[PDB]
Amino acid sequence: NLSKLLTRYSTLNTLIKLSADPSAINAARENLGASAKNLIGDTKNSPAYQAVLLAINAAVGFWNVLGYATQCGGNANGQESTSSTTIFNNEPGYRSTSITCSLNRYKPGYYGPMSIENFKKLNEAYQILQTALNKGLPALKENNGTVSVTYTYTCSGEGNDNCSKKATGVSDQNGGTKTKTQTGKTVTTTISSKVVDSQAKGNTTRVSYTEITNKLDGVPDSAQALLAQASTLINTINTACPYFSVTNKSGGPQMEPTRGKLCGFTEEISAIQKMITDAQELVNQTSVINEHEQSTPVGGNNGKPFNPFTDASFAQGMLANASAQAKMLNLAHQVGQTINPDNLTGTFKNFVTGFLATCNNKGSPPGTVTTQTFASGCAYVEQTITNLNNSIAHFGTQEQQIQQAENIADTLVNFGS
């Protein structure tokens, strides 16, 4: 009997009254439209935006912490080399804005050096991420922005084939150029090659080298696309699982362990993978929201009073829209809790508070690599956790409005079934 239960659950009675009233339903639908703009159209105040940003920064920060300590080398086939030095620019090396891969003889592989092939994949994802962070991530709804990205690396040493025609696609090693396209979006890549003799004016380094420049145009900077880059970054590290060994500064904070394999940071890597996974799911709710717009008013028809049992075919879409917004908000929260040092323990807590959430650059804008970036995240991790929490606190009203819209729609889906 229904009186007997509206006795105890008086808020259920209010819910039913609202579900029978077009003007309460239309108010809830307006609320959903405004909260959707907060979630997918804003930046500072969107918890969804802040959580995407945080997932990306944690991946980037992870490599800023460990990249300088990571062995790499060999030749183009993932094979060992006799005397190859390959240097990647705008990377966070030891007292340097480049990372040098020059470990010879050892076979690239697990607990060994990272192959140049893996490093190239890693490096490209990194350069793209840092260029986009530097320019500022767009709101979640902006799906067609692009960024331009340029990066360089060099090869020296006898037998080094990492800058050759097969590695590169480029015909003349001195002065040649090649263009190729790729993917929903077309990205153009221009690769050019130049040789610099040991004697040339300039040329600190005693030695002859080849320089490769890559210029990518039309790189998508949408959230979904940047998350895919962050995933490539962290998965390449975890799959390649190269040897590292760290310089622990006398004084400083202490990195444990000091030698080992990169995939040995298992809690850190799992956490970051899980953040990215949750942010990809979060960004997927965008299309659910878009395809179920709530801006058309609803009512009875032919001037007949509204009948909640027959006139409510919109409810399904309203519920899917409300549920999707709630899901964004919960996943945004869950990204934050995965990395927030307040709920972390032991070695993983030390990693985040001592390294990942710090920056040693002498704030520098996001995406800047200096000779002091190494061993620190330099990716605004702490500021982003704070801004995520601030944005969630400023979403108190909208969250209740979303729950209410969901309860209304769900009451109407029930009545119509």
Epitope: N340, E399, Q403
Partner: nanobody, 113 residues
Framework: VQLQESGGGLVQPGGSLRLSCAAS????????MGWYRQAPGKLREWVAA???????NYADSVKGRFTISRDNAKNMLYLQMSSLKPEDTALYYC????????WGQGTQVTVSS
């Protein structure tokens, strides 16, 4: 997984009251926390929130009259209410934001002359 409000009662307009909420660690720690209320004939309304670092914000209906605070060592959330009005009469609840989906009992506040 526990939310326990207390401190409510019947007071006079113009009056004061301080509400308490004991929350479990897993709800409270490193989360935004907040207060809500449910008045007769209405659904639950958000009232105030506070970040782990202590930054408070408020709904317009209570701003300048209520103060939310938190005690991170004891997992306690507080709402100091002043210049109370009949319209502040309601069941008050605390939760994290976003909400854990089981609400506690709440605590009744009645303001009446």
């Amino acid at each position: 997984v526990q939310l326990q409000e207390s401190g409510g009662g019947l007071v006079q307009p113009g009056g004061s009251l301080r509400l308490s909420c004991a929350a479990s660690g897993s709800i409270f720690s490193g989360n935004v926390m907040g207060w809500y209320r449910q008045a007769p004939g209405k659904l639950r309304e958000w009232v105030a929130a506070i970040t782990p670092q202590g930054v408070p914000n408020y709904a317009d209906s209570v701003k300048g009259r209520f103060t939310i605070s938190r005690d991170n060592a004891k997992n306690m959330l507080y709402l100091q209410m002043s210049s109370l009005k009949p319209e502040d009469t309601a069941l008050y609840y605390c939760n994290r934001l976003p909400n854990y989906r089981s609400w506690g009992q709440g605590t009744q506040v009645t303001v009446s002359s």
